Design a protein around this ligand. Structure first.
Ligand code: HEM
Ligand code: HEM
Lengths: 787, 787
């Protein structure tokens, strides 16, 4: 065969197999392709030329091809994996033909290597993937000036797919606006060949809208300087404007320090505003576990939705949260979603940092730039120390009401001023034993140690009253008010007391505010009982049903009555006998004490008047004004007019003054009681004033009696220490010519001691207990003397 | 021949040329490839099929090859363009061989249409331009994460080229810099994830520079849903991270809201830190003008300055300010400078919104919201109120300095906390009649009504040392200091009492952190004069420059001496003859009262010892020990040791005491005096006690002698009632030998008035001025008695 050397000297592998599939030819080209020697294959079966994984199957194909009867070969059209002798595989192609000669069918295969072809194919595939993941549209144009290569970004921006956009001129078939933006002319003026110049144009998409595009252009020449190719990089402008707006809005909102769940909503709503028709959400990693933070209002699902999941990480370290966004596919481009994701992530990180720093500040700071007062972070550390020492404080929970009116009408700036003015009132009226704090917002706490009802009611009433004068804020009155609750118990943890006080606050505010209450009912009905007692006292003093008793005072030596004293008494069927030591404080706290004094003065004068009219006379009655808390500006008028109403007998009436009530206060009364003194009223004292000035005002005010009170005469028996000052008092009286009376004597030893010390007049249980006006005349007529 | 008919049915193009170039081996595939028919080719020279450019050379090439005798065929490897019979052009690949048959040498050429491969070649050539133009580093990774593709941006950024960075790991080439914190694991995690993700890494370039980059990884899947490739995109974020640092710092400041002129400085400082060799200026709009807010002080030389002027606008959109930037040519990019301008203009926008809100109410609100204290308007009102009442106050201008320490160590919130702590100290030490306000920043004003320089100095010193303990916040100590300026007049302008105070404050602040000053012309030097007198008093009390002085006492009932008194006297020529009224309160203030206290009695004991050497008998001697302001800390020990210091009997020395010092503490003073009273030293007293004459009678027997102060005897012509006081004394005196000492006699009309009422002892100027030390050993010997 003359054509056999033609096959032999070729560079393409030649294989010839017969009807029996025995290989008849195997050139060095096939040798180098398969790694085999020609002797191994000449005259042998086609089996070894088949790869092992296909060897059981290929001979079936071989016999099927023979039995098919087709006159053409359709197999081996595509690439095939050729495994050589060592076991390594390559890509090869075949040009097999079917030959029928000498009454037998033969196969003549020419084998070529496609290694470089497959390598270039994979290269092109990886390149198209890279070009797709490029975040900016790219078009390659030629001197034929048709869109040759497209991009995924270009497809997603302008809607022209690869096949459609292929083979069309860019600046003529891409639809123009209806205006004079002559894209092709702009490109062809002086720019096409050499100018890397940019300009703004408008383009039309598949949806229908027209968008602004930058169309940066650049040519590429080969070595021969001929114009080889060209690149156009379309870039959007609405996207960049919206991204800048998103940054500005997020920073503008965040700089005002909103609450955490408001900042989350701000981020969500802004991401939505940039990308309409989407559902966004935020989770924060607390203790390694996500927690929901915010979401869009429209919680319904989105058809054909796609999700972008971004990890919110702080300035250094572990993730702090997870943002996720879902939006309908084909709505906005992938690069634009990615930009919004990056901006939102890098702002949520700052939100987390601010919240963390805020929590760190909250767990520490004690004072407050607003209100200038300690906040609860100091109240905790102070009240725990108080309660640790086993002393039981009294906690006042104060809540100012009706602040929203100012908050609305004039705003938060002036609401702060109103609250600051109230704080100033509290500061000006507090006391050194008290502690003031503000817990949250418009709720305050006052810690006191005056643990008794009498002080508690007084201080609570004063706190409630501090707001009697309306808060003035820029020439507009505002009548604020307070709801104040009291808590007090021993040994209980501060949670108990705080809870009780807050319960009282809630009760009073629900009832209507403007008031004060106790928690424990056992501590609460006492106020009601005292109010009932005060009402009873007021009604009785109005109705003139009080009583007077007459202590007798007798010379220790001669035995005659030196005088008597008027002692207030108070008996009521609904309450029983109540002593003055209890119900004079009640009169002082109710504000009816002036009328009590009026009654005692008038009744004593009248009761002396009946006896003086009768055939009996007594030296004087002492009416204990300062003991009855007579101290007021209107002292002399009543004493004078009551005396005038029954007769001019000034030498028979005497008034008592307590310890330093005439000097420290009531100067205008000390400067006027001289009128009574000149009228004829006597004067008696209990304690001497400040040294060299309280000496009966340098005996100016002609005091006549000193009353050694019971507190000393009860202990005179057991203390020569007190006996010494008793002797001094007696000597001072004797020297100054003052008379000395003793109060509260009971025993004969005490009387003898007073006699030897030379006490001039003695009163008490030893001689005669205080007795009524109906029994004083008989006793004074019958019994004389008691020495 | 059957190989020609075999390849007739083959897809391989084939041509064979003989000696005469007449083709006898040509197939329908070749007919399709070229266009000439078999009848037109067979027996015809091939030269008709050759492009015309090889007409004079093709046969010449055949002859040259034949003459050279190339045994092995290696030509026609390169792909060649071809022109068909109809003029169409394609690309073909040849395969040549040499054929020897019929005693002649023939040439075989197989031909294939290389269009299906040159399509891929022109595909990848065009795709490379697209993948390389945009300057964005993208890489493609296999399933095992080996890198397979890279582009121009990647090689120009990270140094490595494709050949070096082809077929290996994508992190070994991206090894982290020397900072080993977290990037070493962050890479290994991101690069091995299996979902879309992105992080920021510190990476070291091949040449050794440091780049902060943002890396994103995303997978691409084939049809069979298997993981096919991983594309990774990097991006340089150095400028972005600088902008993020700016944003973080400005948020960290504006969440605390420092003063306006400091927020401006913060913005400008960060601008200079983010921009290179630039200038920044910010202007607000007041009444329609550009008013300067703050500008960077970095006035470095700028070459070819580029200017930008953005109009920061309010919420309503009206222009409100100008953010003007000057940049060097080529220092920063247009996009960078525009972005920085936009960020800073939003920050400045919110700052100006705050400032415009604040400015509306600054002249109306009375209180100061930063600390709850009154504001400058309130001080204006207070000073107006005082000047209307014609009372000139003191205006201490407190300046809290070294606040900058907390400013640059922790920040503005902690600076406010420190201010709160200092004002809490101020209020806890504040007195009831002291007015306090905060004018601006860290400047407070304290207005009072004192006028004695000792009191003023005391207030200033207590204000200075109320901060002596450093403000402990988070256990970190900060030694704040204070500057104080004082202003006085008989009344001066309401704002001038602040400007003048600020003169002193500025003087002290510039010339030393901690201290205080009056005004130089009059009394800032007087303070120093008093301090010099204090140093002189220290010197004199150390070196016994003082001298005791003596003044006799004579029985009123004609008789001899009762006692000799002691008084401290001082005389230094440099300072003159300072009197007791001047140097005793100074002695207390300076802190050396104990020295004079012990000296006055040590000299007393020694002097009695010396006088005893002769016929001098010393009926009594009285050191004062009461006007010297003794404390209870060391009262008894010194007076006790003075006795045994020279062996003096306790029945001639005496002690005078005052109730004010006696009742400082009701526990220890009288207990200390008990030891002395047991010793036998007399206890005189002054103006009477307050405890109902008790301890004046029993605990210490201080009525051994009781005195009459100077202020009563001279005025005795008005208080004639003092006869009662003297009779009161004389009662107990005739009881148990108790004397009274009248003092301050000048003339006979007063002497006879004081003597007509029985007073034992008379002493004063009427008898003798205080004799110097040495005269008594003659005076006593001479005058006995005086009658
Ligand atoms: C690496 C070695 C081989 C591989 C990968 C292989 C695989 C294949 C496959 C899958 C086809 C059919 C393609 C299609 O239907 O689209 C084919 C075609 C064919 N190849 Fe093979 N085979 C191999 C070995 C051989 C050998 C050594 C011969 C020797 C003559 C041969 C002769 C044929 C025949 C007769 C057909 C049928 C063509 C037709 O029916 O149109 N094969 N080959
Ligand atoms: C468009 C058609 C053709 C062109 C442009 C062309 C051109 C060339 C060129 C440039 C060479 C030398 C470099 C190289 O071989 O790569 C060459 C070699 C050669 N060509 Fe062609 N040729 C064409 C067609 C043919 C055909 C159909 C034959 C048929 C036998 C042929 C026969 C040869 C021979 C014998 C050599 C010598 C190779 C050697 O000595 O190594 N040429 N041709």
């Amino acid at each position: 065969g003359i054509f056999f050397p033609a096959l032999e000297q070729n560079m393409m592998g030649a294989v010839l197999i017969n009807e029996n599939d025995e290989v008849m030819f195997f050139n060095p080209a096939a040798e180098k392709l398969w790694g085999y020697k020609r002797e191994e294959v000449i005259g042998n079966n086609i089996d070894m030329l088949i790869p092992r994984d296909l060897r059981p199957a290929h001979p079936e194909y071989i016999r099927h091809n023979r039995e098919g009867g087709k006159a053409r070969v359709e197999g081996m059209s595509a690439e095939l994996q050729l495994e050589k002798k060592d076991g390594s595989k390559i890509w090869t192609r075949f040009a097999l033909s079917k030959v029928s000669a000498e009454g037998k069918v033969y196969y003549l295969a020419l084998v070529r290597d496609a290694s470089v072809e497959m390598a270039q194919k994979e290269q092109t595939r990886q390149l198209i993937i890279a070009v797709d993941h490029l975040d900016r549209p790219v078009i390659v144009l030629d001197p034929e000036r048709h869109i040759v290569q497209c991009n995924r970004a270009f497809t997603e921006m302008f809607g022209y797919c690869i096949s459609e956009a292929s083979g069309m001129q860019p600046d003529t078939l891409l639809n123009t606006p209806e205006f004079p933006a002559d894209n092709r002319i702009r490109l062809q003026q002086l720019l096409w060949k050499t100018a890397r110049d940019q300009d703004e144009f408008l383009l039309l998409t598949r949806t229908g809208e027209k968008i602004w595009i930058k169309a940066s252009i650049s040519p590429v020449y080969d070595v021969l300087a001929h114009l080889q190719n060209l690149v156009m990089t379309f870039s959007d402008i609405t996207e960049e404007r919206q991204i800048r707006q998103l940054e500005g809005n997020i920073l503008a909102a965040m700089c005002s320090s909103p609450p955490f769940h408001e900042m989350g909503e701000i981020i969500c709503r802004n991401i939505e505003s940039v990308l309409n028709e989407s559902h966004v959400s935020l989770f924060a990693l607390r203790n390694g576990m996500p927690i929901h933070w915010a979401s869009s209002s429209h919680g319904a699902e989105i058809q054909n939705a796609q999700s972008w999941s971004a990890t919110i990480r702080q300035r250094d370290g572990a993730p702090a949260g997870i943002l996720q966004i879902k939006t309908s596919s084909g709505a906005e481009t992938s690069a634009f979603i990615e930009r919004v994701a990056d901006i939102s992530q890098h702002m949520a990180a700052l939100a987390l940092e601010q919240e963390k720093s805020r929590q760190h500040i909250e767990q520490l700071i004690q004072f407050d730039p607003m209100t200038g007062l300690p906040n609860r972070n100091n109240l905790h550390n102070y009240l725990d120390d108080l309660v640790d020492k086993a002393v039981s404080p009294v906690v006042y929970l104060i809540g100012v009401d009706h602040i929203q009116d100012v908050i609305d009408s004039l705003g938060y700036a002036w609401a702060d001023q109103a609250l600051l003015e109230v704080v100033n009132r509290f500061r000006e009226k507090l006391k050194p034993d008290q502690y003031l704090c503000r817990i949250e917002g418009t709720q305050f706490v006052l810690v006191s140690l005056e643990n008794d009802v009498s002080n508690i009611t007084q201080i609570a009433d004063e706190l409630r009253n501090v707001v009697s004068k309306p808060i003035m804020i820029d020439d507009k009155p505002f009548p604020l008010t307070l709801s104040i609750g009291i808590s007090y118990d021993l040994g209980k943890n501060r949670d108990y007391l705080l809870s009780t006080a807050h319960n009282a606050m809630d009760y009073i505010r629900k009832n209507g505010g403007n008031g004060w209450q106790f928690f424990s009912p056992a501590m609460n009905e006492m106020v009601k009982e005292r109010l009932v007692l005060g009402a009873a006292l007021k009604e009785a003093i109005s109705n003139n049903q009080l009583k007077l008793v007459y202590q007798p005072q007798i010379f220790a030596e001669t035995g005659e009555l030196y005088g008597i004293e008027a002692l207030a008494r108070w008996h009521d069927p609904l309450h029983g006998h109540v002593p003055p030591s209890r119900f004079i404080p009640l009169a002082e706290e109710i504000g009816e004490i002036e009328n009590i004094g009026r009654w005692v003065i008038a009744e004593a004068c009248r009761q002396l008047a009946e006896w003086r009219s009768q055939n009996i006379h007594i030296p004087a009655l002492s009416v204990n004004l300062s003991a009855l808390h007579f101290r007021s500006n209107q002292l002399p008028n009543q004493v004078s007019d009551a005396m005038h109403a029954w007769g001019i007998d000034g030498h028979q009436l005497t008034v008592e003054i307590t310890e330093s009530m005439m000097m420290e206060h009531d100067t205008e009364i000390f400067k006027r009681i001289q009128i009574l003194r000149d009228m004829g009223v006597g004067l008696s004292v209990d304690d001497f004033g400040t040294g060299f000035s309280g000496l009966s005002r340098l005996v100016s005010l002609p005091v006549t009696e000193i009353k050694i009170d019971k507190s000393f005469v009860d202990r005179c028996l057991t203390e020569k220490r007190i006996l010494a000052l008793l002797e001094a008092i007696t000597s001072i009286g004797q020297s100054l010519n003052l008379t000395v009376v003793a109060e509260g004597v009971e025993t004969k030893e005490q009387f003898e001691m007073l006699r030897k010390i030379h006490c001039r007049v003695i009163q008490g249980y030893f001689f005669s207990r205080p007795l009524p006006a109906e029994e004083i005349p008989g006793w004074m007529s019958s019994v004389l003397p008691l020495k």
